[PDB]
Design an enzyme around this catalytic site. Structure first.
Site, PDB file in Angstrom:
ATOM      1  N   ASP A   1       3.024 -17.559  -4.030  1.00  0.00           N
ATOM      2  CA  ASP A   1       3.350 -16.429  -4.858  1.00  0.00           C
ATOM      3  C   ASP A   1       2.178 -15.975  -5.724  1.00  0.00           C
ATOM      4  O   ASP A   1       2.172 -16.136  -6.944  1.00  0.00           O
ATOM      5  CB  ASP A   1       4.609 -16.741  -5.682  1.00  0.00           C
ATOM      6  CG  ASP A   1       5.043 -15.597  -6.576  1.00  0.00           C
ATOM      7  OD1 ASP A   1       4.762 -14.421  -6.274  1.00  0.00           O
ATOM      8  OD2 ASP A   1       5.684 -15.883  -7.610  1.00  0.00           O
TER       9      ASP A   1
ATOM     10  N   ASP B   1       0.829  -1.200   0.000  1.00  0.00           N
ATOM     11  CA  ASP B   1       0.000   0.000   0.000  1.00  0.00           C
ATOM     12  C   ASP B   1       0.870   1.259   0.000  1.00  0.00           C
ATOM     13  O   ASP B   1       2.071   1.187   0.219  1.00  0.00           O
ATOM     14  CB  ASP B   1      -0.980  -0.015   1.179  1.00  0.00           C
ATOM     15  CG  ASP B   1      -0.321   0.212   2.517  1.00  0.00           C
ATOM     16  OD1 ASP B   1       0.596  -0.550   2.904  1.00  0.00           O
ATOM     17  OD2 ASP B   1      -0.774   1.143   3.215  1.00  0.00           O
TER      18      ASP B   1
ATOM     19  N   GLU C   1       3.486 -10.044   0.466  1.00  0.00           N
ATOM     20  CA  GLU C   1       3.533  -8.590   0.341  1.00  0.00           C
ATOM     21  C   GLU C   1       5.001  -8.186   0.494  1.00  0.00           C
ATOM     22  O   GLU C   1       5.840  -9.031   0.775  1.00  0.00           O
ATOM     23  CB  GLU C   1       2.701  -7.903   1.440  1.00  0.00           C
ATOM     24  CG  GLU C   1       2.450  -6.431   1.138  1.00  0.00           C
ATOM     25  CD  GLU C   1       1.414  -5.767   2.038  1.00  0.00           C
ATOM     26  OE1 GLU C   1       0.934  -6.387   3.014  1.00  0.00           O
ATOM     27  OE2 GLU C   1       1.088  -4.597   1.747  1.00  0.00           O
TER      28      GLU C   1
ATOM     29  N   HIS D   1       2.061  -8.952  -3.527  1.00  0.00           N
ATOM     30  CA  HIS D   1       0.925  -8.100  -3.210  1.00  0.00           C
ATOM     31  C   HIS D   1       1.527  -6.689  -3.189  1.00  0.00           C
ATOM     32  O   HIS D   1       1.921  -6.173  -2.149  1.00  0.00           O
ATOM     33  CB  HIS D   1       0.390  -8.477  -1.836  1.00  0.00           C
ATOM     34  CG  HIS D   1      -0.855  -7.746  -1.472  1.00  0.00           C
ATOM     35  ND1 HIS D   1      -2.105  -8.182  -1.855  1.00  0.00           N
ATOM     36  CD2 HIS D   1      -1.042  -6.568  -0.832  1.00  0.00           C
ATOM     37  CE1 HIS D   1      -3.009  -7.298  -1.472  1.00  0.00           C
ATOM     38  NE2 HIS D   1      -2.390  -6.310  -0.851  1.00  0.00           N
TER      39      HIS D   1
END
Ligand SMILES: [Ca+2]
Ligand SMILES: [Ca+2]
Ligand SMILES: [Ca+2]
Ligand SMILES: [Zn+2]
Length: 541
Positions: free
Chosen positions: A512, A167, A521, A482
């Site tokens: 994966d 993020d 991530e 991610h």
């Protein structure tokens, strides 16, 4: 016709086999070199790429309690001549080619640092790696609003810094262990790191490249102090919820400063106090700005001893709610003392240090940063330390380093973290090198340095999957992390230089796939641990 100086050459032609697992980057002369073979076998040859047999050995069996399998360990540590080799195992096949060189980890270190540069926020980034061009335009240039801080829907500059993980939000508590790890790498291996040039915009100034990258993050951390001069530090800059898989420059939602936490305030003090002493030689004015900010927040902390959690109900992004701020406050006191020298700070550190039952923890991450404080205190050359406390920390450190050595030596794949798996555990495997390197500084022992290489080898191929856990490096690296930049650009290969979090709760649980934020991530605290691990082996002799 073979002469008396012709060397033996491999007869048969071998095919790559996934059951031969080893560090896919390479090894350093004079240190351990092992491979784990997941097949019955005995004889193995270390072969130069030209076919020359350089060493013949026999693999020894061992039960991997972790994966509950019998594996064969090929030890070829005696091979010390630089070159490119492969392992040939009659009946199984061969390993990937790997190098033996003193500088084998330098490209990996530069790539992990490239990973940090590519995580920059508030600016456009651009890099060409393996011929593929990765870039994105200026993002989050309107950070951030004061709504949740004071009430006014007004903007206070909070640009720069690094996106935290998959993020784009920026969190202070996580920046704590990240910045702390990287600044400790600089302090511990300064001579090895100072001359390193990186592919960053600041390659042509008067500051060592490694420090320019850290400056990008400290520039952001400085904007997190409350605007009321109270010394309280906002917990994070975040959108209200996790946005979608889009490029960062396309995220237009408003980002807000989220109410303070005592842990974030203590981490801020530790980070800016370290920055003050580390940057002084290069930018004295910047260092002055840092130490003054550190003093304001430390005075606040000194007067408000309570553990306070950030009020972040209106937000649904990362919490990073460390359960306690005792460790954070201890780290802050050690850094203020190391930078400034005042007896006040030393007294604060020692009073808190005594309250810790076990001085050094083998498993630590963003939630427990006490080790960082213990490390700074232990290696400080300043006078005045209570000798009894020093001996206590020292014993704990060596005892802990010994445990990690024994764990990696008894693990079928040399995993320093043994059988422990949890969210972000790959980061801890390499973060344990900090304990081993500090133990080696206090009591030189090659077992400490070899165990550190085991942690690094684990992440680069000597693991159950026979896969590198770092994007763009080694054998069959993660292809689907991610990660929003990776999932939203039009490039096949993901962004390079990132250590993925890792599987759990078991040894074979890593997947994966892009949806797995639990095991696949990327994150600044994981890359920081990798950077520290590799740093000690850059410009190494
Ligand atoms: Ca520079
Ligand atoms: Ca904590
Ligand atoms: Ca992509
Ligand atoms: Zn951004």
């Amino acid at each position: 016709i073979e002469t008396k100086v012709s060397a033996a050459k491999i007869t048969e032609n071998y095919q790559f086999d996934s059951r031969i697992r080893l560090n896919s980057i390479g090894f350093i002369p004079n240190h351990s070199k092992k491979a784990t073979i997941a097949a019955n076998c005995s004889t193995f040859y270390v072969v130069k790429e030209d076919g020359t047999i350089v060493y013949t050995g026999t693999a020894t069996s061992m039960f991997d309690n972790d994966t509950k399998e019998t594996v064969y360990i090929a030890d070829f540590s005696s091979v010390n001549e630089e070159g490119t080799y492969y392992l040939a195992v009659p009946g199984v096949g061969k390993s990937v080619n790997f190098k033996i060189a003193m500088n084998v980890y330098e490209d990996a270190f530069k790539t992990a640092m490239l990973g940090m540069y590519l995580l920059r926020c508030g600016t456009s980034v651009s890099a060409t790696y393996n011929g593929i061009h990765y870039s994105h335009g200026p993002c989050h240039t309107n950070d951030a609003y004061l709504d949740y801080i004071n009430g006014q829907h007004t903007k206070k500059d909070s640009t720069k810094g690094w996106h935290d993980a998959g993020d784009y939000n920026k969190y202070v508590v996580n920046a704590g262990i990240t910045v702390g790890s990287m600044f400790l790498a600089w302090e511990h291996f300064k001579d090895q790191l100072e001359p390193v040039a990186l592919e960053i915009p600041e390659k042509n100034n008067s500051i060592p490249d490694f420090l320019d990258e850290l400056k990008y993050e400290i520039d952001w951390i400085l904007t997190m102090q409350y605007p009321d001069g109270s010394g309280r530090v906002a917990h994070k800059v975040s959108t209200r919820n996790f946005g979608g898989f889009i490029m960062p420059e396309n995220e237009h939602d408003e980002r807000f400063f989220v109410p303070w936490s005592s842990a974030a305030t203590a981490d801020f003090v530790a980070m800016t106090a370290m920055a003050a002493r580390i940057f002084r030689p290069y930018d004295p004015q910047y260092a002055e700005k840092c130490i003054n900010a550190a003093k304001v927040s430390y005075e606040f902390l000194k007067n408000n001893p309570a553990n306070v959690f950030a009020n972040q109900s209106g937000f649904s992004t990362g919490e990073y709610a460390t359960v306690s701020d005792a460790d954070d406050r201890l780290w802050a006191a050690a850094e203020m003392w190391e930078t400034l020298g005042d007896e006040e700070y030393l007294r604060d550190f020692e009073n808190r240090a005594a309250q810790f039952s076990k001085k050094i923890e083998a498993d630590f991450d963003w939630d427990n940063v006490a080790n960082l404080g213990m490390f700074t205190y232990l290696l400080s050359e300043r006078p005045g330390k209570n000798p009894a406390l020093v001996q206590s920390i020292k014993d704990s450190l060596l005892s802990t380093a010994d445990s990690i050595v024994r764990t990696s030596q008894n693990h079928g794949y040399g995993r320093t973290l043994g059988t422990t798996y949890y969210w972000g555990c790959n980061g801890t495997v390499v973060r344990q090198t900090m304990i081993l390197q500090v133990a080696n500084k206090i009591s030189p022992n090659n077992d400490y340095v070899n165990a550190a290489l085991d942690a690094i080898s684990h992440v680069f191929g000597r693991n159950y999957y026979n896969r590198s856990y770092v994007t763009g490096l080694g054998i069959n690296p993660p292809m689907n992390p991610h990660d929003r930049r990776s999932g939203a650009d039009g490039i096949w290969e993901p962004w390079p230089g990132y250590l993925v979090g890792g599987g759990w709760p078991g040894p074979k649980d890593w997947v994966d796939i892009q949806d797995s934020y639990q095991t696949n991530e990327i994150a600044i605290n994981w890359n920081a641990a990798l950077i520290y691990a590799l740093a000690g082996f850059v410009n190494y002799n």
